[PDB]
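A common beginner's mistake is to predict each chain separately and then try to dock the pieces by hand. The better habit, illustrated here, is to supply every component at once so that their relative placement is modeled jointly.
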Amino acid sequence: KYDIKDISLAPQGRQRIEWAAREMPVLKQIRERFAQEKPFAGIRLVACCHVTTETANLAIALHAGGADSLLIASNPLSTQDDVAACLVADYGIPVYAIKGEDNETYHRHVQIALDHRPNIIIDDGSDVVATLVQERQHQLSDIIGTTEETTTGIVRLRAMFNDGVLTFPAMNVNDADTKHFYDNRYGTGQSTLDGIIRATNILLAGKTIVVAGYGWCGKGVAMRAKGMGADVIVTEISPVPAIEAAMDGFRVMPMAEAAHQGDIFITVTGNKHVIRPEHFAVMKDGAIVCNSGHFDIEIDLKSLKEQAKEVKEVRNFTEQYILPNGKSIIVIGEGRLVNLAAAEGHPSAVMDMSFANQALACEHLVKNKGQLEPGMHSIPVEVDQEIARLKLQAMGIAIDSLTPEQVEYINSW
Amino acid sequence: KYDIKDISLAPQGRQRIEWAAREMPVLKQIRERFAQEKPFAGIRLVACCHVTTETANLAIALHAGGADSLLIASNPLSTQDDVAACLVADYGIPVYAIKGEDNETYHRHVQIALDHRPNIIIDDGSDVVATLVQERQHQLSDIIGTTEETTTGIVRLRAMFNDGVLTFPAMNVNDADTKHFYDNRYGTGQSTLDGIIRATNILLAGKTIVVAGYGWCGKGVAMRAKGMGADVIVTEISPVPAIEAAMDGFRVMPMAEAAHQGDIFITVTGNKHVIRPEHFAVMKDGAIVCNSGHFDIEIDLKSLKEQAKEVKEVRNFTEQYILPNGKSIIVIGEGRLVNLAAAEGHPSAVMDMSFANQALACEHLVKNKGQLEPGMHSIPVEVDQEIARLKLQAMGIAIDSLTPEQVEYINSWA
Amino acid sequence: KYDIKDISLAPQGRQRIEWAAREMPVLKQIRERFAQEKPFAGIRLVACCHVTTETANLAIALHAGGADSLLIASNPLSTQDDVAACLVADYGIPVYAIKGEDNETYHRHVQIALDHRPNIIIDDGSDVVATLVQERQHQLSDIIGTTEETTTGIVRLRAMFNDGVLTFPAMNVNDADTKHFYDNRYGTGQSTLDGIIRATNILLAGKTIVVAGYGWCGKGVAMRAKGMGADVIVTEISPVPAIEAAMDGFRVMPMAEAAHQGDIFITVTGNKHVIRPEHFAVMKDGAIVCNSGHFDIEIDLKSLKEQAKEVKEVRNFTEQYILPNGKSIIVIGEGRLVNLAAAEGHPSAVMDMSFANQALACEHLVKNKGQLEPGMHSIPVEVDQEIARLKLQAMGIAIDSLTPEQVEYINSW
Amino acid sequence: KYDIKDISLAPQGRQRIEWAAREMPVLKQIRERFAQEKPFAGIRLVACCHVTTETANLAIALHAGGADSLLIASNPLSTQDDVAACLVADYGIPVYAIKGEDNETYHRHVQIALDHRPNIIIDDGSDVVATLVQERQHQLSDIIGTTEETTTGIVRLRAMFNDGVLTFPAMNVNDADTKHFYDNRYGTGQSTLDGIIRATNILLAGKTIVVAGYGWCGKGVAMRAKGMGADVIVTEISPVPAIEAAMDGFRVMPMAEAAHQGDIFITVTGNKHVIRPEHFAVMKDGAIVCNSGHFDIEIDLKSLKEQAKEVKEVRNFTEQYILPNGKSIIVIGEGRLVNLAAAEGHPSAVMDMSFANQALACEHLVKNKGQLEPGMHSIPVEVDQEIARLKLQAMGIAIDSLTPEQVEYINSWA
Ligand SMILES: NC(=O)c1ccc[n+]([C@@H]2O[C@H](COP(=O)([O-])OP(=O)(O)OC[C@H]3O[C@@H](n4cnc5c(N)ncnc54)[C@H](O)[C@@H]3O)[C@@H](O)[C@H]2O)c1
Ligand SMILES: NC(=O)c1ccc[n+]([C@@H]2O[C@H](COP(=O)([O-])OP(=O)(O)OC[C@H]3O[C@@H](n4cnc5c(N)ncnc54)[C@H](O)[C@@H]3O)[C@@H](O)[C@H]2O)c1
Ligand SMILES: NC(=O)c1ccc[n+]([C@@H]2O[C@H](COP(=O)([O-])OP(=O)(O)OC[C@H]3O[C@@H](n4cnc5c(N)ncnc54)[C@H](O)[C@@H]3O)[C@@H](O)[C@H]2O)c1
Ligand SMILES: NC(=O)c1ccc[n+]([C@@H]2O[C@H](COP(=O)([O-])OP(=O)(O)OC[C@H]3O[C@@H](n4cnc5c(N)ncnc54)[C@H](O)[C@@H]3O)[C@@H](O)[C@H]2O)c1
Ligand SMILES: Nc1ncnc2c1ncn2[C@@H]1O[C@H](CO)[C@@H](O)[C@H]1O
Ligand SMILES: Nc1ncnc2c1ncn2[C@@H]1O[C@H](CO)[C@@H](O)[C@H]1O
Ligand SMILES: [Cl-]
Ligand SMILES: [Cl-]
Ligand SMILES: [Cl-]
Ligand SMILES: [Cl-]
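With all components supplied together, the output reads:
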């Protein structure tokens, strides 16, 4: 039926869900259009997403479109139990997600999710799609297509394609302009610092903050860190973004040099073990480390636990590791996505554009069922452009249009 | 002997208090010296402050110095019930403060605090000091001196002085360099937006944020709103801060003109009725108003309650007022100091210096008992500068010092 | 032989050219490599570029590579006569460019340039390449390939391809990451405000500055304008960049609304008549207008001249137009690229990366002569990436490299 | 009767002077009132200022008020020869100032200015006032009062006062709100980088820029360096501005530590030998040093000239010193105020307020002749605030005013 924490939390989820609806006008139009055209009639669907108020508004949209939906958590700490309760209670959408569930339960929910025999799979981090490929080859005849929300999921699908196992259409939702130009940049920018502050109420001004990676997320995090008064260090593996950060006024250096200097560390690389044992040993006493990439494995907390003589919870979402010399390493959110673990995730304004993309990419998969080459597909430019047009309109912002003479001038050489 | 929500919240309170101390090293050195020298022996003290982790650390330092302290809330919505529980349970420090208490309860706590017969009064907004002078003229022999934490309190103290009723010393803690340069600016800047985001999780980037007042607080709020991607409008009544705001890149305009453009309004003026019905009437459907000045009277909420046909709670610390024509005004924290009502207030890093000023100001009053002129006193320059030196050192920052030749150059004029 | 203003200015050009060489280390290596491999042996070449100290350093690089080079001006006001003098005098490179030459002389230099019968044509704005196609079809057998420096030139080549007349390889230098991520953004950002300040010494802080277009140049100009204390308005025709500007803290609105509010206007669209007659009539008395797109036609100065009763020079590079009601419109640089007309153009740091691209794209054309499809070609990723690596090294900035385990993790799904 | 480079440059000078006036409307209203009331009738006046378009506009306004003025250069490298030509040719105003004059010529102009027997002295750095007090004690009966434009002059005036030799009124123009809040911060911020860029056309983005001193000037320079994409390091000697710089997001450290990291160094401290040989020795090959404090002595260039084996001019206003080990130090403007040596100085928009203070301060001295105590005087609050009001209005910016009810709230304390 469902697997949640407490069903009596539904009136709180419903409240917070509709509050978030106010800045999801684009997804409001698509759900309004879906309820009249029912694109997902007779379609079974799985979403593996962060159980937030925004994700609820997407599920409501696919529900209105006729989909038979089952939501599971993309992360044990991102789940909001009040919205998981409202979804089961007010819409009948089975949800298998409990805040702080153990890893046995996460995979038990994945097994429950695939037994839905989904036609569409919305994924975020590519966990269900990888499990489907590895354990349920017999279920591939059910797949019309899948979607992927986050950069880390797109990298794994690239390895699925190059391994020869991406034998179905996968909509690359994360790489749409209206997705990661905003979500990854502006959303992660604000909400990462939100999580750090809700966890610690630490003053960012006057601290050295080390941002690992200067991609979409890294640019946003460094920008908001600087905006909040911090001295920002950036690390990288690629020369083009490293030059960007330097010309943006940020200090670029190897992580081994930055480990001696940082007060707060924020990983947003998508890569494994970006903060390492040899980095913990030179960190300032009381240095704070956290992660805003999709998986917690950007920080080597395994090694940290073995290097430490004592660990202790000292505030919400905050652990103090004490080393044998008495120095302390602070870890927020157990290394999980700090914006989702220690706060509420992205404001709905950006998830409007993310889940507008998610909604239409699902519509795209069904509308072209049987006509898609296997492998990755981009969001059509017109869809991506129309989302931006609707969002701009909804922000109350008007811009210019070219005149017939301006159009003719572009075409002369 | 106290009046708190629930004393079983003490262990959470203790955990949060210990965390806050990690960025209060100046106050830790002061507390450690007070424990040895006992400057407050035989002194009864009343503190009217926001009952936060940072105030607890101040209370502890006063308690180490031998103070017989009693603590009450400076605002009904800023109280942290776990902090109040911990100070009572772990330290035996009487606390009369309940988060969300009505005004009758607040006024009763002031009377109870005055019944402590304080010798020193630490105030935040000057409620207790005003009530003492207004009602307890027979008690004024107790008073060694008082202190005042915030700008609005300093304004009330000036009006008391000009009335000829400030017949005892009052330490202007707010105006110390190491107080309002950092607390009022960098503290309010971060924690105001913190409160707004904890209340609504709204995206600040792309919103138009109207900041009423461009003093120490207004500069911090606009600074941080701009850092978070917002389009900032500043309103003012004085031309010097108005020009500063323009050359800092912000749009300056009268509030009647900002009223139809703002998505979020934040008042930090210290004045009354900064946002009025004629402003509510033209605001965008769904506009957010909140206040980070000391009192909620910066926004005319009483008129808004009368105009609206409905008010609903729509999120924690968030109310939706629906006007007769159907448009919505959104209020955070019932207009009370939003950083303290919807979040936790300033980070301890800045309260370290503000409350270092409070501790050294109380020591200043006792050591100079019977030697200070009545009226408002600035924090001694030596005290203010030494707080700055200790904080910089604790921040791990090193700077230069003048050579004898450079000192020789300054005193020259030929 | 050449067509310059004054040959006795050579010692001043040589001085300023080598000063600019200090922050052109990447182009230093390529010229050093070219002098040993002589990629342009027996090759005739034309450059139509801004006659600046940086352009001189590029010409020196192609000279060292064996090229028989002839430089002409891309704009009458961008020419620095001291560097035009040093090129003819110290290297023997014929130059036909005179600061403030009339439009008869510009085209007379273009006719002189094509009579060189070039094998390679480096262009900036696509003027010589368009004239070659239109008037010298008989010379197309000489073309191994061409290059294009600026966004406006790429748009014209797109119209040349779509018209069916781009019958040769054209290297798209402008769109390399190391080109327009820096040049167009950071270079135009600083040097546009440099031109405005050298022209007027006006305080930017406290002024409303209107930036037309939020592309690479627009993002840089708005960023530096804000950094200098200005209230920034942005105009656009496309929803995605318009949302970017809003979420960057800038006010986005139609130009017709911004015309009432701006103190300084800066066009960087690449399009025609972005500031119009109906905009001049509502501008504040004393409003300043200038252009940093490639052609002056972004502002309709033709109409401004007819609407005005009087025009008057009031400072260097600065004209005052007085309207019949007495209000004034200030025009800087006659509407030409204000960074080049009123100052010196981009600092050499960015032109290092631009002309490194220019150098190698020319080497690319000859190394693959006869093996290139007709039409536009991008800078090879490896070239673009190697430039960034060399520049980062030369800035003294070190970054990280993935470990073998980090590489293996990326490849698992 | 004057001493200028070339009087044929007057028409260029006149064009630049008229342009500068377009953003000097407060001074234009003052000039227009002076033309009517002639406050300076029968007054001889000496001005020691940077001979710029903005100073010319001030000189014109003084000339309209009837002043018999004589102008000399405050610095050998800040003089604009076309301005000096115009003031002499068009206005008959004696100017003794040549751009790049040696020190003998400078000192001779001071003697010539003192021979004018001034009644009012407008000074910029206090050279003339110091020389008057040191050498012309028999002349002090002439003096109605003097003014001082800049922070270094105020420091010298304080040292004169503490010596007991400041026996006449001296108006502190620098410290007026409408002066150092905008001129020293927003003016120096823009024009310092302007000077650097006009000298070198170097890309500021990605460079490490070391700003010595975080006062009014230092805040502006760091602010604008950061706005232009630079990585900013701040050095200091006092903890209060040091903490501010950190909470503004800058790296604070001793100069010995910044010396090996900076690409560009800018001194705005008012102190002597802020950059020393032990700093030159560890600087990056090719590092830029320059100064925007009043005197060039902030950088120990005399030691650098001794250490270096060669010095070459490599660009306008740009010298390359080559040390014995072959590494280069680059100096802009010979260490003189780089905004004024390599560019044009502050935009007129801010000098409008600074020089409005100069004009109203000279009027203040004359109207109060024989009524002021000797020593340093602040600009009257009424004058300072009225300059701010007029500038805001001229900037087209409108703000709010207090209702009677809000005034009633401020005076209340109950
Ligand atoms: N927490 C959130 O709300 C949220 C939202 C969106 C994306 N994400 C996650 O954030 C991560 C980054 O996504 P993105 O959009 O920024 O990706 P991206 O591809 O645009 O950028 C990642 C950057 O990190 C750099 N990098 C990689 N390995 C590195 C290393 N070892 N050290 C330093 N730099 C390194 C890359 O060169 C690149 O510039 C992904 O895991 C993504 O799923 C999180
Ligand atoms: N919430 C917090 O944690 C916190 C912290 C410190 C102070 N405060 C409070 O914030 C308020 C402001 O303090 P401050 O230090 O900024 O004071 P301030 O004296 O430095 O500046 C206040 C500014 O408001 C302006 N102003 C006054 N009335 C105005 C009006 N009607 N419209 C627009 N502008 C107006 C003044 O001209 C001045 O520039 C006070 O009530 C103070 O007690 C709150
Ligand atoms: N002056 C310089 O030193 C310099 C350097 C590089 C490029 N440029 C020139 O600057 C111009 C812009 O180049 P870019 O790299 O920014 O190009 P771009 O393609 O990256 O961006 C141009 C932007 O302008 C917008 N735009 C187009 N027409 C518009 C209109 N009528 N109103 C408002 N916005 C409009 C487009 O939507 C786009 O976002 C080109 O002409 C280019 O050649 C100048
Ligand atoms: N170039 C211009 O146009 C212009 C304009 C105004 C003032 N000035 C000059 O700029 C200088 C600074 O003026 P201001 O208004 O900023 O003064 P200020 O009093 O506001 O600040 C000077 C700062 O320098 C710091 N400082 C002093 N010695 C130092 C040292 N050895 N190392 C580091 N920091 C040190 C002080 O602690 C202080 O914070 C003065 O010489 C003034 O006359 C120049
Ligand atoms: N965390 C906090 N703890 C105690 N007082 C606070 C806190 N944050 C702000 N304040 C104080 O509250 C006053 C406003 O009433 C300000 O002057 C400020 O110093
Ligand atoms: N454009 C200018 N004209 C005249 N004086 C100037 C100019 N720019 C800066 N100054 C002044 O020079 C002083 C420094 O000697 C500063 O106090 C400042 O007011
Ligand atoms: Cl749609
Ligand atoms: Cl102490
Ligand atoms: Cl190479
Ligand atoms: Cl006046």
